[PDB]
Design a protein around this nucleic acid. Structure first.
Lengths: 72, 62, 72, 143, 189
RNA sequence: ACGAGACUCUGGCAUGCUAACUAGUUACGCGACCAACUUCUUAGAGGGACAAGUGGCGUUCAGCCACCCGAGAUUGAGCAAUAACAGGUCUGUGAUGCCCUUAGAUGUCCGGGGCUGCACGCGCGCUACACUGACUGGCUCAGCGUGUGCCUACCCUACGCCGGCAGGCGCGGGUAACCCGUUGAACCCCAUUCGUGAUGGGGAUCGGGGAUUGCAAUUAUUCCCCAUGAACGAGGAAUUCCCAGUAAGUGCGGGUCAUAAGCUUGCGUUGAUUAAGUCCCUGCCCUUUGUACACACCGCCCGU
């Protein structure tokens, strides 16, 4: 009974849900997985792409909850 | 329903067909100190402080 | 030695005890009591390990206290 | 970390018709000869990693696995990876496909019934053929 | 430089009263940086009462037969993503952190009457520890079932666990179950 | 005067003691600037704990409760009072009292049917519910113990034929803290993982690769893999065991033996929800009481 979410990557729809994570007070893979009801691995990939963009620093790794933070 | 601090003076014992309640006597410290008895449950150690949220609950003995 | 609770917390037992012996045999007893008191007043469980050990398989049962099922 | 592949509401591999609800690449129970250590070995031999995004995995890797299983005897790779090996009627391990065919051949019960043996009836009644004890324990098999 | 943890301290948290340390008691060797102090809480009664409620909270998830007692589990749970939340909050979670659970607590449980009759229960109480931690035990079951066959899992409930830990106000769920039972059995006064 | 206690064995503790060429090591030490009077393991003449200190309950007695201190504050077992029972054993014993069958001696001889059925007539047994269950093989793990001629012909095991390892054959060591072995096809963990539970998560049979080599094994000996999908997540009436290193999970070793275990006897390893109570059920004991019972309530006993 898994829900149906829009996962297709489009010229328009792709750039409408990727800029909605930082619009929340509590922004963690746990909060996103319990509230927005999409895989937490997608949120982990999103924060990995943010780390690739160079605005944060990776500290440690885990299969569920990873550590990515900043000191600036 | 006031909150009163009382000290256990003596532990009487248990009751029930198989034993499921505990009896202690608690005395008030700031309410014109007098001796009131009340049944109790769980670890209520030797002369600890039992909190009375009410001054009317008694222990029906035997 | 294998076992986390064994060699861990034994590293702290060793640091406390080596400090104690060093200060006692080298400088004085007063500095020993001060710093040792700090270390072993942070926690007690250093100087004392659990005396608990596996106990003998007893009489007519699978283990120490469990007994084989009785029929009538 | 992006891929231009499009989500496919209908996907077809081996003409099976089963309820597609969960993820893929280890729910390949519909595929008969891939998975676990052998598939891991093949994928590691192909020199691929796990730097992509899970959830959306296509089926090309397992297609390549079956392609290599089409000619598995050329490279002398350890040959205890097929299901029915050293069977009569051939000295090799040929190809078969489609469901409704494999589950029967998991029990090749024609010659062992033809020989007038207790083995045919031991296998046929759904009972033991090696002797699993069936009076107090050992009651599973029909419920 | 005797500051508790690496972040807290014992020099600014004062109540100017020495009668209300029944929930948080950090004044002696019992203060713990990380709760993995080993020990046996079933050796004698009044010893699981002597537990620090943080340790009882985290350990009392030792239920099922396969996840029972394993202290590596609880220490990993309370370390993982707690290390994250400390640097991710910055502000004080103290408000909710105290203000849901640690005075959600009930005020009375019940006991059996006479020698027979399973239709009502005589209302009693305990000095708050046993009743609060019985609510905590039913909350262990409740938070489990909020994870057990559910969506929010273990090793990620750190907010709610700090709530279940700290100090004094009312928002809980299994505790209001206990309060429904409270009123029902309290109709016998 | 016995029994109880004491006692014996066993665990738990030493900046102490007695010393080890099988554990353990210091600046005229190399194979490396580009023969420490003995302590971790082993085991001995000793020490240590006494309700001893404090507080509170107790004709201020015996003692009880709690608390420091402490390695440890009712701490595993063994042994265990006359009378008892027609309890079991004559199939453990030229241990042992005679009424008394048969030749088809309850002797031999890899010899030889069953019992290894399935409408169950019963009893002891073989088994864990999710990021906890198991794989990355990416860090030094445990035992408790066993191991080769009076009999006797039967011991425990360290490389290669090589499919992917016990292993059909050559090979050495160990009568053992010397070898197996710092216990040679094992943690429970984990970059094969479950996003909310029939999937990857724990196996309904049942087939191949070379089988340890036991005439037989099937009418009891002998590996993991293809993922082939089994009410796939707290259980008629009745109930058995259990209070901290209980239970339960888990493997290992002894006995039986041909390395024959699903049995038992021990051993570690992970590790514990509940209870520090009661006499309600089943019983037991220290009293008083009743009895027409004494083969002792399964008694005795009344009625056409």
């Amino acid at each position: 009974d898994k829900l149906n979410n829009l996962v297709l990557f489009d010229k328009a729809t792709y750039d409408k849900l990727c800029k909605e994570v930082p619009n929340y007070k509590l922004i963690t893979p746990a909060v996103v997985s319990e509230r927005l009801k999409i895989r937490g691995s997608l949120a982990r990939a999103a924060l990995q792409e943010l780390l690739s963009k160079g605005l944060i620093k990776l500290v440690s790794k885990h299969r569920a909850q990873v550590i990515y933070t900043r000191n600036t | 329903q006031p909150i009163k601090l009382a000290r256990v003076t003596k532990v009487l014992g248990r009751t029930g067909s198989q034993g499921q309640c505990t009896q202690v006597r608690v005395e008030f410290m700031d309410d014109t100190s007098r001796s009131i008895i009340r049944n109790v449950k769980g670890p209520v150690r030797e002369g600890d402080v039992l909190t009375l949220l009410e001054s009317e609950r008694e222990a029906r003995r035997l | 030695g294998g076992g986390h609770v064994a060699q861990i917390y034994a590293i702290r037992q060793s640091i406390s005890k080596a400090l104690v012996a060093y200060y006692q045999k080298y400088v004085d007893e007063a500095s020993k009591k001060e710093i040792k008191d700090i270390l072993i007043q942070y926690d007690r469980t250093l100087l004392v390990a659990d005396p608990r050990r596996c106990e003998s398989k007893k009489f007519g049962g699978p283990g120490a206290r469990a007994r084989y099922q009785k029929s009538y | 970390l992006v891929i231009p592949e499009k989500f496919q509401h209908i996907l077809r591999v081996l003409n099976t018709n089963i309820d597609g609800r969960r993820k893929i690449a280890f729910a390949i129970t519909a595929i008969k000869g891939v998975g676990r250590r052998y598939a891991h070995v093949v994928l590691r031999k192909a020199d691929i990693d796990l730097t992509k995004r899970a959830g959306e995995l296509t089926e090309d890797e397992v297609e390549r696995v079956i392609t290599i299983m089409q000619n598995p005897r050329q490279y002398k790779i350890p040959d205890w990876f097929l299901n029915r090996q050293k069977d009569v009627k051939d000295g090799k391990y040929s190809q078969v496909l489609a469901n409704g065919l494999d589950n029967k051949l998991r029990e090749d019960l024609e010659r062992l019934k033809k020989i007038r043996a207790h083995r045919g009836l031991r296998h046929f009644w759904g009972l033991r053929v090696r002797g699993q004890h069936t009076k107090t324990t050992g009651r599973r098999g029909r419920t | 430089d005797i500051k508790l943890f690496g972040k807290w301290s014992t020099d600014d948290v004062q109540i100017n009263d020495i009668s209300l340390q029944d929930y948080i008691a950090v004044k002696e060797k019992y203060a713990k940086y990380l709760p993995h102090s080993a020990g046996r809480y079933a050796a004698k009664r009044f010893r699981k009462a002597q537990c620090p409620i943080v340790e009882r909270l985290t350990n009392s998830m030792m239920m099922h037969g396969r996840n029972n007692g394993k202290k590596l589990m609880t220490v990993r749970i309370v370390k993982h993503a707690f290390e994250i939340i400390h640097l991710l909050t910055g502000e004080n979670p103290l408000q909710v952190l105290v203000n849901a659970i640690i005075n959600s607590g009930p005020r009375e449980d019940s006991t059996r009457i006479g020698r027979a009759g399973t239709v009502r229960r005589q209302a009693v109480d305990v000095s708050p520890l046993r009743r609060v931690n019985q609510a905590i035990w039913l909350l262990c079951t409740g938070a489990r079932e909020a994870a057990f066959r559910n969506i929010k899992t273990i090793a990620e409930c750190l907010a709610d666990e700090l709530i279940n830990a700290a100090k004094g106000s009312s928002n809980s769920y299994a505790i209001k179950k206990k309060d429904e039972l409270e009123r029902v059995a309290k109709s016998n006064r």
